[PDB]
Amino acid sequence: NQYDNDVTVWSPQGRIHQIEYAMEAVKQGSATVGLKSKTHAVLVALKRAQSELAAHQKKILHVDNHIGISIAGLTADARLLCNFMRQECLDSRFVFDRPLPVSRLVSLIGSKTQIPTQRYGRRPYGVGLLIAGYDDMGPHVFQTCPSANYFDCRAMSIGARSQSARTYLERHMSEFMQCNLDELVKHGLRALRETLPAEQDLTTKNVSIGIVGKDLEFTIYDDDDVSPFLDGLEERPQ
Template identity: 80%
Template sequence: MFRNQYDNDVTVWSPQGRIHQIEYAMEAVKQGSTTVGLKSKTHAVLVALKRAQSEIVVHQKKILHVDNHIGISIAGLTADARLLSKTQIPTQRYGWRPYGAGLLIAGYGDMGPYIFQTCPSFNYFDCRAMSIGACSQSARTYLERHMSEFMECNLNDLVKHGLRALRETLPAGQDLTTKNVSIGTAGKDLEFMIYDDDDVSPFLEGLEERPQRKAQPAQPADEPAEKADEPMEH
């Protein structure tokens, strides 16, 4: 995206009917590390991927505590999200810069567990399961495929589903570890808890190994290509 005369203020519309500052904030969310939220009848779970700029830098926290029953996970600009978790009035002023952070909010209330997604475009959605951030479409595909299983899951199984969905966003050869994963849980008679580092180990130990994608062998140049109407070997 390039700067132009219509992106100096959040109240200025372009001739195409777009608000560029909101689009910039939405793009920041798409570039952020992936986070997954899902719920059952009794619990709500957040699973987030933590990034570090280098091996000598500590991984940034991606799940934040709001109160005893609510927590948020972040995709986008971490500094903006930290401000959102502490202040309310600035988020209600339409003339301010849109915060470049997307949030998944998990908690437990009178109506049971819940997952909400909030966007820099001022929209929010009540979700059964959701993923935001970079490569989040791969996680959403997993969530959609297993949606019918979530409601009857206990806490441990629900966390495993979240980890599997998050793992789908990783490149080949990389897997989830205690250093790059953070987990948040809430439920009935259960305060919002955040699991980091060694506390994540029990959940990862019960997770099956990531299946390896087998590369198709290259076809020799002197052999004719398979016909379109013939089934390919697997």
């Protein structure tokens, strides 16, 4: 029309159209399930490669060994948010000497995301991050969007074909919370496999897991221990 010609120009929709374009970038991006227990927070992500003669690479990017992110959208844009996040963890360690409170940590990102949305025609960052963090309050799995608004979710799944993954989170909504850490990663791969059709099913190559928590640093398993978790199928009947 002429109300998305910049992001300064307001829409008579109540939300600028340009904010909503940014939401499609994240949907077009990788299926990701993010769930938490009451000790650990787990990020299950789906890898993708840009060639046939290439071995798929993590869509879990490290913020640090205590707060970590999973990308849904552009890899570059996720990394751009990441660098700021990495700095905060580097300062948290100086000032507090604890893992930075996750809710605090998400609001500072939100402040940054807020800024191009204010500027003339400039791009809101078209990544959604599922942020897994462990602080003194407990584990937190947050949903961050292309707006400045963050949701604190029990379990949320964002990206492509994520509704089938989302009905799984609903079914075992109470279960994640009580469970042991190995099981928390197991429901995530079961949920993540639900996005894919009955035909297409998760294998060790395309599975990336980010586990953070009370007892341990952020570790990425790309074929490190993906396998025992991968075990048992349960897909959505399409």
